[PDB]
Design an enzyme around this catalytic site. Structure first.
Site, PDB file in Angstrom:
ATOM      1  N   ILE A  71     -11.366  36.508  13.184  1.00  7.87           N
ATOM      2  CA  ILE A  71     -12.435  35.762  12.528  1.00  7.87           C
ATOM      3  C   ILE A  71     -13.769  36.394  12.924  1.00  7.87           C
ATOM      4  O   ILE A  71     -14.034  36.596  14.108  1.00  7.87           O
ATOM      5  CB  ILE A  71     -12.394  34.260  12.907  1.00  7.87           C
ATOM      6  CG1 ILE A  71     -11.183  33.585  12.245  1.00  7.87           C
ATOM      7  CG2 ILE A  71     -13.707  33.570  12.526  1.00  7.87           C
ATOM      8  CD1 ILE A  71     -10.875  32.179  12.749  1.00  7.87           C
ATOM      9  N   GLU A 160      -3.699  32.633  14.705  1.00  4.37           N
ATOM     10  CA  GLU A 160      -2.554  32.718  15.615  1.00  4.37           C
ATOM     11  C   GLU A 160      -1.281  32.179  14.975  1.00  4.37           C
ATOM     12  O   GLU A 160      -0.196  32.729  15.189  1.00  4.37           O
ATOM     13  CB  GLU A 160      -2.837  32.028  16.959  1.00  4.37           C
ATOM     14  CG  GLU A 160      -4.034  32.608  17.735  1.00  4.37           C
ATOM     15  CD  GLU A 160      -3.815  34.011  18.307  1.00  4.37           C
ATOM     16  OE1 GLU A 160      -2.846  34.700  17.922  1.00  4.37           O
ATOM     17  OE2 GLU A 160      -4.629  34.432  19.158  1.00  4.37           O
ATOM     18  N   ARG A 163       0.098  34.773  12.696  1.00  2.00           N
ATOM     19  CA  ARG A 163       0.759  35.837  13.464  1.00  2.00           C
ATOM     20  C   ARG A 163       2.131  35.462  14.021  1.00  2.00           C
ATOM     21  O   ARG A 163       3.013  36.319  14.133  1.00  2.00           O
ATOM     22  CB  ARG A 163      -0.130  36.286  14.623  1.00  2.00           C
ATOM     23  CG  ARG A 163      -1.401  36.984  14.212  1.00  2.00           C
ATOM     24  CD  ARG A 163      -2.357  37.003  15.378  1.00  2.00           C
ATOM     25  NE  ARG A 163      -3.599  37.713  15.088  1.00  2.00           N
ATOM     26  CZ  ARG A 163      -4.740  37.500  15.739  1.00  2.00           C
ATOM     27  NH1 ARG A 163      -4.797  36.586  16.702  1.00  2.00           N
ATOM     28  NH2 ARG A 163      -5.826  38.187  15.423  1.00  2.00           N
TER      29      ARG A 163
HETATM   30  C1  LIG Z   1     -12.719  41.826  22.635  1.00  2.00           C
HETATM   31  C2  LIG Z   1     -14.195  41.797  22.964  1.00  2.00           C
HETATM   32  C3  LIG Z   1     -15.027  41.507  21.719  1.00  2.00           C
HETATM   33  C4  LIG Z   1     -14.181  40.840  20.641  1.00  2.00           C
HETATM   34  C5  LIG Z   1     -13.759  41.847  19.577  1.00  2.00           C
HETATM   35  C6  LIG Z   1     -13.287  41.140  18.312  1.00  2.00           C
HETATM   36  C7  LIG Z   1     -12.610  39.816  18.647  1.00  2.00           C
HETATM   37  C8  LIG Z   1     -13.328  38.651  17.975  1.00  2.00           C
HETATM   38  C9  LIG Z   1     -12.867  38.484  16.533  1.00  2.00           C
HETATM   39  C10 LIG Z   1     -12.212  37.124  16.322  1.00  2.00           C
HETATM   40  C11 LIG Z   1     -11.276  36.785  17.476  1.00  2.00           C
HETATM   41  O1  LIG Z   1     -11.667  35.535  18.056  1.00  2.00           O
HETATM   42  C12 LIG Z   1      -9.831  36.694  17.000  1.00  2.00           C
HETATM   43  C13 LIG Z   1      -8.925  36.158  18.101  1.00  2.00           C
HETATM   44  C14 LIG Z   1      -9.557  36.357  19.474  1.00  2.00           C
HETATM   45  C15 LIG Z   1      -9.029  37.621  20.140  1.00  2.00           C
HETATM   46  C16 LIG Z   1      -9.911  38.029  21.315  1.00  2.00           C
HETATM   47  C17 LIG Z   1      -9.348  37.503  22.629  1.00  2.00           C
HETATM   48  C18 LIG Z   1      -9.346  38.591  23.697  1.00  2.00           C
HETATM   49  C19 LIG Z   1      -9.287  35.793  15.956  1.00  2.00           C
HETATM   50  O2  LIG Z   1     -10.221  35.469  15.193  1.00  2.00           O
HETATM   51  O3  LIG Z   1      -8.117  35.378  15.817  1.00  2.00           O
END
Ligand SMILES: CCCCCCCCCC[C@@H](O)[C@@H](CCCCCC)C(=O)O
Ligand SMILES: *[C@@H]1O[C@H](CO)[C@@H](O[C@@H]2O[C@H](CO)[C@@H](O)[C@H](O)[C@H]2NC(C)=O)[C@H](O)[C@H]1NC(C)=O
Length: 246
Positions: A71, A160, A163
């Site tokens: 996201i 999630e 996935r």
């Molecule tokens: C990893 C450090 C910066 C973040 C890079 C992109 C991650 C943010 C994009 C949305 C994110 O929240 C994902 C899930 C989170 C995964 C990061 C946890 C380590 C998502 O939207 O499902």
């Protein structure tokens, strides 16, 4: 675009939304019968728009990067909101351009940063369909601390679940009552990139993982995943992060 409405929502309609979400993600290849997300997509086509409606019928549009199910930001009335990270800033160049103002959230989208901002780990944040309704309502009016918690709920009940079939089922069980995620749920979330990598590495390794993945099971016990015959690979995981992005 995909859509989900909390008014009249049940395990069935939620299941349909998660199916729609998965189907909206492009792939040219399946690896061990699991869709392989693309290395990259250029232009506005990189981003899927999820239209989510709370019980009262108020709406947010969520922008999701189709290569990784991350996201990037969302639109609430006439204000857009994006995570404080380069990938999200890039996303702001293509989505919600007609917004009157753009707010950059004071955190990135990664679980660790969101948990810090929310003031609690997601082990302690109840999730489910009622929690998702709450999350949508919270995101409608800017409050960065509250938004962190709302986004933790949003990510888990959408991305999630897309996935992992197990996570989708977890939320279906929480259709009318919120509950903190199982340790198995947290484990799978944390291991998605790792599992995606190893399933792809198994292609030229006779279905065997180069490095075993450690997971917590439904009974709450720590287990090692070593090959593609594991239930996690055959039944659970529904989307693979491309190794080009790992
Ligand atoms: C990893 C450090 C910066 C973040 C890079 C992109 C991650 C943010 C994009 C949305 C994110 O929240 C994902 C899930 C989170 C995964 C990061 C946890 C380590 C998502 O939207 O499902
Ligand atoms: C492939 O993975 C399976 C697990 O999915 C491994 O089998 C398990 O391993 C041992 C027996 O070999 C037992 O302790 C478990 O009860 C087995 N689990 C299941 C579900 O059958 C198997 O050893 C792995 N094969 C290779 C070649 O690595």
């Amino acid at each position: 675009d995909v859509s989900f409405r909390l008014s009249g929502a049940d395990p069935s309609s939620y299941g349909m939304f998660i199916k729609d979400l998965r189907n909206a993600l492009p792939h040219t290849e399946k690896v061990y019968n699991i869709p392989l997300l693309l290395p990259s997509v250029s232009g506005a086509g990189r981003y899927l728009l999820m239209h989510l409606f709370n019980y009262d019928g108020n709406t947010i549009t969520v922008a999701v990067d189709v290569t990784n199910v991350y996201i990037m930001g969302y639109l609430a009335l006439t204000t857009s909101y994006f995570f404080n990270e380069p990938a999200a800033d890039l996303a702001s160049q293509y989505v919600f351009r007609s917004a009157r103002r753009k707010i950059t959230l004071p955190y990135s989208g990664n679980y660790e940063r969101l948990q810090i901002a929310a003031g609690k780990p997601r082990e302690k944040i109840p999730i489910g369909l009622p929690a998702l309704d709450t999350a949508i309502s919270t995101l409608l009016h800017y409050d960065s601390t509250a938004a962190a918690g709302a986004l933790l709920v949003l990510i888990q009940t959408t991305a999630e679940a897309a996935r992992f079939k197990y996570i989708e089922q977890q939320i279906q069980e929480r259709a009318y009552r919120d509950e903190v995620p199982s340790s198995a749920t947290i484990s799978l979330e944390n291991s998605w990139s790792g599992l995606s990598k190893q399933i792809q590495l198994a292609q030229g390794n006779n279905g065997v993982f180069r490095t075993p993945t450690v997971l917590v099971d439904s009974k709450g016990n720590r287990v090692q995943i070593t090959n593609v015959t594991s239930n996690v690979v055959t039944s659970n995981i529904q989307l693979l992060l491309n190794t080009k992005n790992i």
